[PDB]
Amino acid sequence: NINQLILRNLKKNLRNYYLYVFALIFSVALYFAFVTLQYDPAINEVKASIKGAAAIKTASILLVAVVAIFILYANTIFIKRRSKEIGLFQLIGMTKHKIFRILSAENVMLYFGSLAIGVAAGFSISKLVLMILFKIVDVKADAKLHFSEQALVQTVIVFCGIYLLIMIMNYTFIKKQSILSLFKKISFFQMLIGALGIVLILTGYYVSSELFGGKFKTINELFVAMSFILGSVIIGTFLFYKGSVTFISNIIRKSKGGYLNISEVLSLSSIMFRMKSNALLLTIITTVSALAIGLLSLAYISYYSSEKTAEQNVAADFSFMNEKDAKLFENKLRESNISFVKKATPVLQANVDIANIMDGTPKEMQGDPGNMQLAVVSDKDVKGVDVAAGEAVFSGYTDLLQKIMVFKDSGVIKVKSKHETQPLKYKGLREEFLVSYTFTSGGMPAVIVDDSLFKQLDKDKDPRIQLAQSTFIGVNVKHDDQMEKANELFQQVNKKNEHLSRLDTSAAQKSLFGMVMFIVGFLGLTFLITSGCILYFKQMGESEDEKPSYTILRKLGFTQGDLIKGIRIKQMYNFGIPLVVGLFHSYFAVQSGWFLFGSEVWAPMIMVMVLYTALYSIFGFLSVLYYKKVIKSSL
Amino acid sequence: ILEANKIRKSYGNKLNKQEVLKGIDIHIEKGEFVSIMGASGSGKTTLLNVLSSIDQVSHGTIHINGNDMTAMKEKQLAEFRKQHLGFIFQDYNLLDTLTVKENILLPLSITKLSKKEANRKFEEVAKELGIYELRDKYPNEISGGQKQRTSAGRAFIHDPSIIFADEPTGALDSKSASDLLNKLSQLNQKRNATIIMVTHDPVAASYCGRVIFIKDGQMYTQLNKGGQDRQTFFQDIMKTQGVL
Amino acid sequence: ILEANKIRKSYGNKLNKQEVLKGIDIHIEKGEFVSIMGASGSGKTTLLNVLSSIDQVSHGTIHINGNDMTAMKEKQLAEFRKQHLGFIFQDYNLLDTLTVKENILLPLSITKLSKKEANRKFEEVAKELGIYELRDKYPNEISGGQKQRTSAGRAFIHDPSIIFADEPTGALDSKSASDLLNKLSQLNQKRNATIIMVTHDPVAASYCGRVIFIKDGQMYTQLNKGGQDRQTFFQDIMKTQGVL
Numbered sequence A: 001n002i003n004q005l006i007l008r009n010l011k012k013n014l015r016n017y018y019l020y021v022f023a024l025i026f027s028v029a030l031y032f033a034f035v036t037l038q039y040d041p042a043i044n045e046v047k048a049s050i051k052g053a054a055a056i057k058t059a060s061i062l063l064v065a066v067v068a069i070f071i072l073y074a075n076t077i078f079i080k081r082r083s084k085e086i087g088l089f090q091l092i093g094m095t096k097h098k099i100f101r102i103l104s105a106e107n108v109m110l111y112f113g114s115l116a117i118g119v120a121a122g123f124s125i126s127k128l129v130l131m132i133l134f135k136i137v138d139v140k141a142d143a144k145l146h147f148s149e150q151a152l153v154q155t156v157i158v159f160c161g162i163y164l165l166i167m168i169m170n171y172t173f174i175k176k177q178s179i180l181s182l183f184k185k186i187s188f189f190q191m192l193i194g195a196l197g198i199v200l201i202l203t204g205y206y207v208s209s210e211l212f213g214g215k216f217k218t219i220n221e222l223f224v225a226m227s228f229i230l231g232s233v234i235i236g237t238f239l240f241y242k243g244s245v246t247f248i249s250n251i252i253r254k255s256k257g258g259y260l261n262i263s264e265v266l267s268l269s270s271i272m273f274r275m276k277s278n279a280l281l282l283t284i285i286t287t288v289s290a291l292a293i294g295l296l297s298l299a300y301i302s303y304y305s306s307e308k309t310a311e312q313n314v315a316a317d318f319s320f321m322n323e324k325d326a327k328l329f330e331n332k333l334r335e336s337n338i339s340f341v342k343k344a345t346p347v348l349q350a351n352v353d354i355a356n357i358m359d360g361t362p363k364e365m366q367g368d369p370g371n372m373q374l375a376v377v378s379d380k381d382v383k384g385v386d387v388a389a390g391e392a393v394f395s396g397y398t399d400l401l402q403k404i405m406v407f408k409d410s411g412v413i414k415v416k417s418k419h420e421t422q423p424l425k426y427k428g429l430r431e432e433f434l435v436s437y438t439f440t441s442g443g444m445p446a447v448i449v450d451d452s453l454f455k456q457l458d459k460d461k462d463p464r465i466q467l468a469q470s471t472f473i474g475v476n477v478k479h480d481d482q483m484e485k486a487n488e489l490f491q492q493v494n495k496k497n498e499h500l501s502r503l504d505t506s507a508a509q510k511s512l513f514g515m516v517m518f519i520v521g522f523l524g525l526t527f528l529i530t531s532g533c534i535l536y537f538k539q540m541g542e543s544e545d546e547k548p549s550y551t552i553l554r555k556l557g558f559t560q561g562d563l564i565k566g567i568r569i570k571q572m573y574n575f576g577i578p579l580v581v582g583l584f585h586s587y588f589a590v591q592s593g594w595f596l597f598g599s600e601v602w603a604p605m606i607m608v609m610v611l612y613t614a615l616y617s618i619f620g621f622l623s624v625l626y627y628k629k630v631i632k633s634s635l
Numbered sequence B, C: 001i002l003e004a005n006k007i008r009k010s011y012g013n014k015l016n017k018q019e020v021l022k023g024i025d026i027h028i029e030k031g032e033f034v035s036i037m038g039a040s041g042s043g044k045t046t047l048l049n050v051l052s053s054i055d056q057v058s059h060g061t062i063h064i065n066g067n068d069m070t071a072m073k074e075k076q077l078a079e080f081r082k083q084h085l086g087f088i089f090q091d092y093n094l095l096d097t098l099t100v101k102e103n104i105l106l107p108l109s110i111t112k113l114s115k116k117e118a119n120r121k122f123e124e125v126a127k128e129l130g131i132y133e134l135r136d137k138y139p140n141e142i143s144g145g146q147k148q149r150t151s152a153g154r155a156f157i158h159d160p161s162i163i164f165a166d167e168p169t170g171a172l173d174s175k176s177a178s179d180l181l182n183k184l185s186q187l188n189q190k191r192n193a194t195i196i197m198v199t200h201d202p203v204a205a206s207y208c209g210r211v212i213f214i215k216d217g218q219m220y221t222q223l224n225k226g227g228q229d230r231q232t233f234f235q236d237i238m239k240t241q242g243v244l
């Protein structure tokens, strides 16, 4: 008789909880794929700055730290829902050992029958993960791989170790169970709680707005401000659920008086008394979702703007530091049938005073305003502008600089020469770049003076701040051709790799940020699935705890087709409030961190949030699909 | 309004048939207070259930305000049941998370009358019953008869054609039941609204104008009262029940 | 059957100690329907735990069929409770994945009993309670009243004598509660069994004959009925409860 009961319980549990099995299979497959990827000797072709074989080692630990927490938490609701089932057995008369055996004989099957499918599905995804990684980064081809038995051993060990914790928790719950265990107006403290919940979030956003380019600038001071913001935005979010949605709901309710409708009764009866109870799980979900979305968007901004940052760093397609290597390169190119447009431009490093052109504070200095290092070039070299005497024109854009080094209008600029000072005035700012980042210090634009003025500036040549090479030998290229062979020739030219190329600088950044893209994307998809499953499981109690309200509404004249709409518009708010809060957090976190990872934004942010919402709506749909069943059986 | 013509129902569970309704002829005009009573295992409850739209029919024809109901569609039947035929139940059937005003004004949400006409009509309906003081008290602090009175007020909001009462005074003391019956009589005399009640208490049938003594699906005639004193009619009903 | 003398329960979690029960004098004979009324905050659950031997007693003497509860150990207490006690709960706590026949017969199959007499007992119980038609159905297609009757039938598969019962009419409407109370009423006129009932709504207690009130332990008096007509008795209970 026991076997029939166990089989029936297993069949019943395989139907109510299937997302649990799906999550188990997905997690096992991903962990096996990551371990196989790490231990395989084939990822050696992907390297930009980090080794890669160690990044996967770190990414294979956070996944376990998330999956184990998910399992150990979601396997508590299951044992709590069996509360009014052990008392009946105790009344009938059974030793606790028999009850423990009955409970475990089902979990053993339901766990191992999924663990034996998760591992067997790792083969189909092992090659696809390599394909995705090799498509994000640039690499030639080919992937063969083998069994990698170490991955099987590690996965089996970990997912058998978790089961012992599950079993000890279940045994502790069974022993702790009681002998049988079978038999409002608004306050004023919540006023203060609701006020604080919004005030803290708003002030955190406002402070985070002026983090960069603000009144405070010190490596030992921005840490404190960051900690204060990251504490405020969390305390406010926590207080937003435990005593701040009740205020808004009460204000909404005390705005219609009497006449209402079934579209609002369920929401105004359930949201206030249910969101308060769970005001620690929702905080964690919102914070982790915001943290994943922000990191993904911040990585994708850099991946998008790498191709322009590389072109901005070096003015031409090739840069050189010595004449010997430049002439060797052109001699090699001579018989390669690839004609080059080579132009040279000397640079005279000099310093001036830009104190009067500051719109902000001396704190935003990045160098002494009166003795800041700059670069000076003549006017005959430039083929776009023809300046005159007593005129200085800037160049470049440097979107980061405009947010920090704000420039005023025309004024007086003092030349800090050896024993003279010729004053000029600021004409304007160009957009193109003329000198590579080697000769222009960090990011300071170079100045352009008149040819006549340069005729004495080069004669002076104050030898105190002059660089090793006061020349900009750079070999450009013709119209579009095979630049790959040109890059190969350039690479074989510099054995000591002491020069600069556009393609290499672009590819390095692309690979380095693509690795983080892949890791964070997979580690965020796993958490999305986990959070959706947890929320769907938590939504199951409301169905069984609200039946003696549907059974009364249906006896007043209402039909199922009229209750289903109210259920839909209640589930909309229930599944949408945390998502909206997380989106707001992510948006106000990204907006304080751009203009530093590169160039364009509003391209990746929407492209990430749209995908996140599209992958998040599924569990919201499934919750309504479940509510339909209990609605149909209410009568 | 009501017109029952040989409405009959057979109880069948695919293996046994035990008919309980054999021959019904009810003539009800607009604006009376009739009652159905008799025995304890008869078909009076089934008669009330089949007269309304809460239960289907087997053999008979029923016409309410000229409309056809015996062969009428299910969705249209639900629409008609929502539009008319207010109901008073044996139990309270009151939602706990709302208040009195919402509880008795919710069934008016389907037909949108804005936030002016409904608020004007609620005061008129609730002041006749004397529950205007109970406008924001939740239905867990008020007494017993006030919940039934709020249910009656909910049933009296949308001005229905026929009101079916299934044992209103079932779990109330004498004073509350008498007050509720007097208020129902006053509401009947104020606005023309037919009320049908099924009760086991002779005092409840005393306030009525006509009473039908059902007997295992038969007629056994009926009383008429009319120009008769309340107490004398009470003893007449007591004698008629004693005959049974 | 049972005798309650100075029934007291102890407490004392951390500092505060609660003396909910301060001695009771309950004398109940064999084969009668007894109901214990009260009010919220009277600790009726603690009283049920003390009398049902689920919670270990602290003071006073309780005798079950002439045997003191404390005279046996824990395992012997469980065996005696299984042999001579049943239970009826407010909820419908049942095995969803078990049929009605198996759910009723589950407590009986443990003690090494042959199938023939078990089937005979199930037949007798189902015929007495009139639920034999749902012999091979499931609890997922059965109304609340039939589920409660199935639970009650399970409570009588091995004949108790001091069977307890919490409020059965907590999640039931009027008709189902009336039917269940009626069935329990004719079940009392059969083989004697104490059916101590701890409901608080006077409608449920109207079918009793030994209504007992609790304010501190017995401050209010008690009613005996005997010759009343189940309506004057109910009115008397309502009035004397309204006195409080």
Ligand SMILES: CC(C)=CCC/C(C)=C/CC/C(C)=C/CC/C(C)=C/CC/C(C)=C\CC/C(C)=C\CC/C(C)=C\CC/C(C)=C/CC/C(C)=C/COP(=O)(O)O[C@@H]1OC[C@H](N)[C@H](O)[C@H]1O
Pocket (backbone or CB within 6 Å): A204, A205, A208, A226, A229, A230, A233, A234, A287, A290, A291, A292, A293, A294, A295, A298, A585, A586, A588, A589, A590, A592, A593, A596
């Ligand atoms: C996840 C994790 C690890 C930690 C958790 C905390 C954290 C940091 C989270 C990330 C943020 C998210 C998404 C949190 C989600 C959660 C919440 C609650 C959001 C809302 C909070 C809220 C409302 C506001 C708080 C916002 C904050 C705290 C930061 C945003 C600004 C940000 C992204 C970075 C600033 C901090 C640093 C160190 C920058 C330095 C980065 C860097 C490459 C430096 C190198 O120099 P740099 O100059 O940049 O690069 C080259 O340098 C050499 C060359 N010569 C050139 O100079 C140049 O090319």
